[PDB]
Write a protein that binds this ligand. Structure first.
Ligand SMILES: [Ca+2]
Length: 280
């Protein structure tokens, strides 16, 4: 554990808190870098010299995910080949391995780093090569394979109809449309679950979803991706005597006006839209 007997270091990527198949994995890339440990000095238990790692020969490496990946396919890997480095002699060459901070909305990128000790011996026929690679969490003495853990947030949207006024028709059915738009990280034809009462429905990103609400009724999407846009529209707004007003409330914040059919970007605050249809 944490000791590889070749010249390759395996680096894994995980999302420990991603367990719900209904949730969409963001289409995203994770970038890993190997740096010299410039503070490396001294000697090992058997007297071997500890030296800063040589990075010429190494490059940044990427692990990619798509919306098709699910909790069961969430662990991926890349391999850094230290045999591409020219070592000038016997020694322990010490590196630091890390994940770059990306820029995708909703994603938390692992900040932990790993100490990687490459034990270099004589190569048959001349010169030198890695014999063992030892990895540990930086600031620890525990041998452990290199693993970076990311997470991503989901959010929600609820849309409710209230019909008000003296002559508001308390069983009239208002037509609504919900459209989720594609983004860089969430693509067309991916599914998000919508709940109306005790029934579940599938909404496809990029296809307007038609539904109906009477007074008191709502739809909700509990596991919406972060960083997409949506539009909510009510087809008969301000018709048949009705004064229609729509509001948006985010988390425990203050309600503000929501313009029917206007794009709203999803972020880390839960959204609730109330459409009031008043008739005095
Ligand atoms: Ca929000």
């Amino acid at each position: 554990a944490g000791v590889s007997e070749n010249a390759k270091l395996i680096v894994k990527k995980t999302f420990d808190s991603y367990t719900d198949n209904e949730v969409l994995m963001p289409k995203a890339d994770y970038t890993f870098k190997v740096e010299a440990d410039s503070t490396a000095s001294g000697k090992t238990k058997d007297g071997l010299e500890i030296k800063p790692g040589i990075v010429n020969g190494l490059t940044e490496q990427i692990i990619s995910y798509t919306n098709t990946d699910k909790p069961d396919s969430k662990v991926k890997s890349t391999e850094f080949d230290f045999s591409k480095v020219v070592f000038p002699g016997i020694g322990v060459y010490r590196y630091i391995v890390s994940e770059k901070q990306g820029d995708v909305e909703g994603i938390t990128y692992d900040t932990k780093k790993w100490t990687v000790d490459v034990y270099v011996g004589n190569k048959e026929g001349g010169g030198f090569e890695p014999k063992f690679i030892v990895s540990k969490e930086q600031g620890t003495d525990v041998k452990k394979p290199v693993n970076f853990n990311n997470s991503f947030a989901t959010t929600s949207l609820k849309v409710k109809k209230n019909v008000s006024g003296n002559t508001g028709e308390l069983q009239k059915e208002f037509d609504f449309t919900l459209t989720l738009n594609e983004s860089t990280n969430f693509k067309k034809d991916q599914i998000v679950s919508l709940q109306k009462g005790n029934e579940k429905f599938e909404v496809k990103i990029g296809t307007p979803y038609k539904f109906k609400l009477k007074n008191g009724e709502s739809i909700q999407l509990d596991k919406l991706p972060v960083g997409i846009t949506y539009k909510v529209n009510e087809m008969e707004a301000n018709k048949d005597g009705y004064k229609t007003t729509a509001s948006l409330k985010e988390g425990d914040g203050q309600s503000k006006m929501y313009q029917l059919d206007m794009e709203q970007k999803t972020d880390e605050s839960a959204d609730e839209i109330v459409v009031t249809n008043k008739r005095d």
